Design a protein around this ligand. Structure first.
Ligand SMILES: C=CC1=C(C)/C(=C/c2[nH]c(/C=C3N=C(/C=C4\NC(=O)[C@H](C)[C@H]4C=C)C(C)=C\3CCC(=O)O)c(CCC(=O)O)c2C)NC1=O
Ligand SMILES: [Cl-]
Ligand SMILES: [Cl-]
Ligand SMILES: [Cl-]
Ligand SMILES: [Cl-]
Length: 303
């Protein structure tokens, strides 16, 4: 840090090596079911005395009993989310599990909330999507639906053209904010490797733009000797160049949902808040569902 000067002292976004602090991340080796990497906050987040090197079986609570049914790997059910209790004092979490191509089993834990009961909201949302008669109507209904379901201060459909340039194609926002409707932005604002990642990982939640990243410990995977592939991690810390851009805009929190059409990133539903904001698993899942439905309608509309 300060003690190293002289000449030698002078981005792959999926290899962040760190998470956002609203969750905890465990990496488990499946030969022994022991934690081989964890976010540095994990023991305090989960109210455990220790975490790194611990067998899942010995972790206070029921995480192991809750994940066992999903571990047999042929069952091609992952990624999957489980609800469990961990820690002393005990807390309910939702645990999102997936396997990176190498490096073990990742378990990302957020504090659990209640059941969200939006099925009566969702029936008519689905009818508006399925009957929209043009892309203009579809995307205008999309921003309204998402704003209603998520409550973010601004919701946009950010559409990509053939050269990758961004267009704010639809927008809705709370009274008195600035409108970005119809603004165009260069393709460089969403780099190609981000777009590929957003084809894999269809929802991103940035809770607080100002957060301090929480590093994984150890940083390198003990299984691979490389950084952990965090492409599938919903807690992944986001590129600092992006976080600066958001700070420059005065945005505090974001939710983005991919629109994938014919296997390409067609656009994004992009939501901004002016205070920190988190949407829990059950709501993210509904967002994902809506985005699949929208992409189906876009495919039909385009011919
Ligand atoms: C209304 C205006 C608006 C713009 C222009 C905007 C750009 C944008 N950049 C990104 C992502 C990234 N941008 C950049 C890079 C830059 N951006 C710049 O302005 C610089 C020239 C350039 C270096 C700072 C990078 C690396 C990402 C990936 C973020 C990540 O997923 O970690 C996303 C996806 C957000 C998400 O999925 O959470 C969007 C939507 N997001 C917006 O809401
Ligand atoms: Cl393993
Ligand atoms: Cl159309
Ligand atoms: Cl139009
Ligand atoms: Cl404030």
């Amino acid at each position: 840090r300060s003690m190293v000067a002289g000449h030698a002292s002078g981005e792959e976004i999926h290899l962040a090596g760190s998470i956002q602090p609203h969750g905890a991340l465990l990496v488990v080796s499946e030969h022994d079911h022991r934690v081989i990497q964890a976010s540095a906050n994990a023991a305090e987040f989960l109210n455990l005395g220790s975490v790194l090197g611990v067998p899942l079986a010995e972790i206070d609570g029921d995480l192991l009993i809750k994940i066992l049914p999903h571990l047999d790997p042929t069952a091609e059910g992952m990624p999957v989310a489980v609800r469990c209790r961990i820690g002393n004092p005990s807390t309910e979490y939702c645990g999102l599990m997936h396997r990176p191509p190498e490096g073990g089993l990742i378990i990302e834990l957020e504090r659990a909330g209640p059941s969200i009961d939006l099925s009566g909201t969702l029936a008519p949302a689905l009818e508006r999507i399925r009957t929209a008669g043009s892309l203009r109507a579809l995307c205008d209904d999309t921003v309204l639906l998402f704003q209603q379901c998520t409550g973010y201060d601004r919701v946009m459909v950010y559409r990509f053209d053939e050269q990758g340039h961004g267009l704010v194609f639809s927008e809705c926002h709370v009274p008195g904010l600035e409108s970005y409707f119809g603004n165009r932005y260069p393709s460089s604002t969403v780099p190609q490797m981000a777009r590929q990642l957003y084809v894999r990982q269809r929802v991103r939640v940035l809770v607080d733009v100002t957060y301090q990243p929480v590093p994984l410990e150890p940083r390198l995977s003990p299984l691979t000797g490389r950084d952990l592939d965090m492409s599938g991690c919903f807690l992944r810390s986001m590129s600092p160049c992006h976080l600066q851009y958001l700070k420059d805009m005065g945005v505090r929190a974001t939710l983005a949902v991919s629109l994938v059409v014919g296997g390409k990133l067609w656009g994004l539903v992009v939501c901004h808040h002016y205070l920190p904001r988190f949407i829990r698993f059950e709501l993210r899942a509904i967002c994902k569902r809506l985005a699949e439905r929208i992409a189906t309608r876009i495919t039909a509309l385009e011919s």
